[PDB]
Each structure stands twice: as structure tokens, then as C-alpha cells.
């Protein structure tokens, strides 16, 4: 029988025998908690066109916030961005008129809205406003529950970026570009 | 009107952890899978330092007749960096595997390979009949029995 005995000694000299080196796969375009060589941060890693110097690993901006990193395994540069962040506002006409409303998610593309809320809420109502046929991508964010119309009326409820929402028509909430008065010559 | 009611935040999907390349993986296989094994009286010593070890691949194979670690689980000891690790390799009779234990006394332990009462290392033993046995028998080993 072949026998091998492993004897470990910890002397005053620094430790040099290791082996816990967990290394997972690389994920891009997905909000994750990344740990790069002890640098821990939550964000969306994406392929970057930056050219770090051979000795440069991290990357920072004027605010001294890590905006880029270099994956040690392969000489690639990945930029970091916050996952989605944003506020949620409710565009609602006077309750005396109707109870239907619309939901505006600030500065986020409409694709991520269902996950940017987790969709695990009251089975109707909240899930109804997490998606639908009437989903409009505005410069102020994503609007769900309002029908975009090519017309232009006087601003009623200011959404932003020159876009306002109203209730006029089966009455329903619509979103449009505010008309800055009536043309005259 | 419009009222800012709440805030939303996309949570991390699962995780990601990335570390650099594997640098000179500790030569555990060089000793475990050594072509030549020294005798018990002259067990071969290999020093291990300045390397990154990986023994889970062989540990989970369940190919070892004994994988006994004293004072720590065989896998838990991995989550700790050591200053030096010595591998002592030899070949002994199966019935003699029990003799490689801390504080044990006998013809082999007291004369060939002695371990202290306080022991934290690991003892691994597996069958070697496929290499140390053949037609006509092998007589290439020696053992020390007499000493002052």
C-alpha cells in the first residue's frame, strides 16, 4: 500500500501554501456582485474599449469611483455601471374621474422594468402595470399604462422631456408631446 | 398630477468571483502518483511552499483506502494558508497502515516513521498491488527493526 503523510507547519515566516482560489465564470450585461482580486462591487460588467497600461488593473473617474476593471485571468477590460436604479412615480387623474393610473420608472429602458420591481406582487394590478401593450420609452424613463398618441395637446400632467400625460379618450390615459400653444401667422 | 411614490433597484442576479491564473499548482500529484516510492525506513520527503494546492479532485475520487485527517476535516483544512507542507511518501503492508498514526508504538512506528502525540496532519493510504507486485514477487524494499 502506498502511504503519503501531509504535515503542515506554520512558522514565523509568511504563509505560502494555499489552494482556496474560487474562480467562477465571466458574466456580462447582468447586474451581479463582482469580486475581482478582493475588489468587491455590485454592477453590470460590460466589454470596454479602454486600453489600460500593462500594470494597471483598476479604473476610476473624477469622482474616484471604480468605473472599470481588468479580469486577471484574461487581459480584458470590463467597465462597470450601476444595475438600474430609478424612482417610481404614479401619473393619476383625479380619483373623482377614474381610478386607472400609469406608472413611470425613471431613466430605465422598458426591458428591465418587470425585473426592476421583481413582479412578485399582488397577482393582478401591480403585474398589470409591470408590462403590457401600452409601454412607451420616454427620455424621462419608461411609462406603462399610458397610450402614446401622435397628437399634441396642452400639457396636463408633466412627465418630462417635453412629454405630458392626460386622461381624455372608453376614456384612457394617454402620453403625448406638449403643444406650446396654437400656431398663428 | 404625478407623484413620486417609491424607488426600484435591480438586484444582483446571482454573483461573480474572479481570481488570477493557477500558479505552479502544488506538486501533490508528483508524490501521490510518483513512479518510484522509497522504503518505509527511508520514506521520501518533499517540501511544499510558495504554491497553490488543489487536492479536491483526488479526494472526491474515493480511490483512497484511508484519508484520515487529525484535528480538521480533509476539506476544511484547505481554507487556510500554511507556511510549509511536507509530504512523506513510502510503501508499507496493508495491515501496517494502522501503524502510521500519532503516538502509536511498534516495530515500524518507533524505528521507521514516528509521529507525535499532538498531530494535525493527514495520512492517506491506498492499494499499490498493481505496481509493487508481479509474478515472482518483489524484494526491493527494506525495513529497520533493530536500534539502540
Amino acid at each position: 500500500y502506498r502511504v503519503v503523510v501531509l504535515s503542515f507547519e506554520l512558522l514565523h515566516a509568511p504563509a505560502t501554501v494555499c489552494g482556496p482560489k474560487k474562480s467562477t465564470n465571466l458574466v456580462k450585461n447582468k447586474c451581479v456582485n463582482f469580486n475581482f482580486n478582493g475588489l468587491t462591487g455590485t454592477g453590470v460588467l460590460t466589454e470596454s474599449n479602454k486600453k489600460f497600461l500593462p500594470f494597471q488593473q483598476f479604473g476610476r473617474d473624477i469622482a474616484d469611483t471604480t468605473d472599470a476593471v481588468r479580469d486577471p485571468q484574461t487581459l480584458e477590460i470590463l467597465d462597470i455601471t450601476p444595475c438600474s436604479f430609478g424612482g417610481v412615480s404614479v401619473i393619476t387623474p383625479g380619483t373623482n374621474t377614474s381610478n386607472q393610473v400609469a406608472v413611470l420608472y425613471q431613466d430605465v429602458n422598458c426591458t428591465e422594468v418587470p425585473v426592476a420591481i421583481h413582479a412578485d406582487q399582488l397577482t393582478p394590478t401591480w403585474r398589470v402595470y409591470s408590462t403590457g401593450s401600452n409601454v412607451f420609452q420616454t427620455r424621462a424613463g419608461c411609462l406603462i399604462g399610458a397610450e402614446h398618441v401622435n397628437n399634441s395637446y396642452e400639457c396636463d400632467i408633466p412627465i418630462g422631456a417635453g412629454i405630458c400625460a392626460s386622461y381624455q379618450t372608453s376614456q384612457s390615459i394617454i402620453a403625448y408631446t406638449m403643444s406650446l400653444g396654437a400656431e398663428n401667422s | 398630477g404625478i407623484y413620486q411614490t417609491s424607488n426600484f433597484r435591480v438586484q444582483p442576479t446571482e454573483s461573480i468571483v474572479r481570481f488570477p491564473n493557477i500558479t505552479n499548482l502544488c506538486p501533490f500529484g508528483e508524490v501521490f502518483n510518483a513512479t518510484r516510492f522509497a522504503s518505509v525506513y527511508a520514506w521520501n520527503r518533499k517540501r511544499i511552499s510558495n504554491c497553490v494546492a488543489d487536492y479536491s479532485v483526488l479526494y472526491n475520487s474515493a480511490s483512497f483506502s484511508t484519508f484520515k485527517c487529525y484535528g480538521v476535516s480533509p476539506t476544511k483544512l484547505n481554507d487556510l494558508c500554511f507556511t510549509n507542507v511536507y509530504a512523506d511518501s513510502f510503501v508499507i503492508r496493508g495491515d501496517e497502515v494502522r501503524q502510521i498514526a500519532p503516538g502509536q508504538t511498534g516495530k515500524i512506528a518507533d524505528y521507521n516513521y514516528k509521529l507525535p502525540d499532538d498531530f494535525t496532519g493527514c495520512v492517506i493510504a491506498w492499494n499499490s498491488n498493481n505496481l509493487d507486485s508481479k509474478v515472482g514477487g518483489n524484494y526491493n524494499y527494506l525495513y529497520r527493526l533493530f536500534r539502540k
Epitope: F8, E9, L10 | G71, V72, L80, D118
Partner: nanobody
Framework: QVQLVESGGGLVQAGGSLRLSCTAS????????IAWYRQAPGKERELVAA???????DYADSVKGRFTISRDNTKNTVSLQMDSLKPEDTAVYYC???????????????WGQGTQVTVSS
């Protein structure tokens, strides 16, 4: 890496009592042995006490019967209590960490910073 921090000590009169604490970090406390050595000005370093990972204890003949050793694994702390202290005990005490291979007992283990203990006549 192995990190030890010593705390306590100070000045005490003859016949009093004192306590030294050693805090551990950067390793697994459950599989380690820890000891206290001491050194006085113009004197060689000598062992004061030692405790293995299984609660086994050992003292020096000069301090046996007066010093008590304990270790709290949950807090990863090692405590030494000195009773009936005498002026000869005045020294800097060092906390040493070693795998119980005689490594801690041989003084080849990791070292901290030390703590001063003074005993007046």
C-alpha cells in the same frame, strides 16, 4: 496571514494579580496552539505558558502553580491570569501561535507585538 494582538498588562504591586489577552485573526483558531513567552531587559526569552488546540496546558517551573491559561474559541481569544505576582515576573510578554508540532513550544511560530508587565517589590 496569522495575526495576533496582545493587550492588558500594566503595573501591579507584589502579591497582586494581572491578566493578559491575545486576540487572533486571519486564520482558523480551532486547529491551532497558542503560548505566552516573556523577556526581561538583559534576559533571554523564556516560556511562560502554552495551550494546545485540545485544551492541554503546560507551564514553566518558575510559574507553575501560579499562572492559569485558558482559551475562548468562540471569541478567538487566549487569556492568561497571573496570581501572586512577584518582581521577577516584570517583563514584556509575547503571544506566539503555532500548529501543535512543538512549533509553538519551540518558539518558531508567529509573533505579535508584546505587552508590558511590571511588578513592584
Amino acid at each position: 496571514q496569522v495575526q495576533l494582538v496582545e493587550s492588558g498588562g500594566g503595573l501591579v504591586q507584589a502579591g497582586g494579580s494581572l491578566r493578559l489577552s491575545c486576540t487572533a485573526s486571519g486564520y482558523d483558531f480551532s486547529i491551532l496552539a497558542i503560548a505566552w513567552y516573556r523577556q526581561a531587559p538583559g534576559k533571554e526569552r523564556e516560556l511562560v505558558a502554552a495551550i494546545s488546540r485540545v485544551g492541554s496546558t503546560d507551564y514553566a517551573d518558575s510559574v507553575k502553580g501560579r499562572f492559569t491559561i485558558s482559551r475562548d474559541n468562540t471569541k478567538n481569544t487566549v487569556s492568561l491570569q497571573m496570581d501572586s505576582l512577584k518582581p521577577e515576573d516584570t517583563a514584556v510578554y509575547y503571544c506566539n501561535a503555532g500548529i501543535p508540532m512543538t512549533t509553538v513550544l519551540s518558539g518558531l511560530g508567529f509573533w505579535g507585538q508584546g505587552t508590558q508587565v511590571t511588578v513592584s517589590s
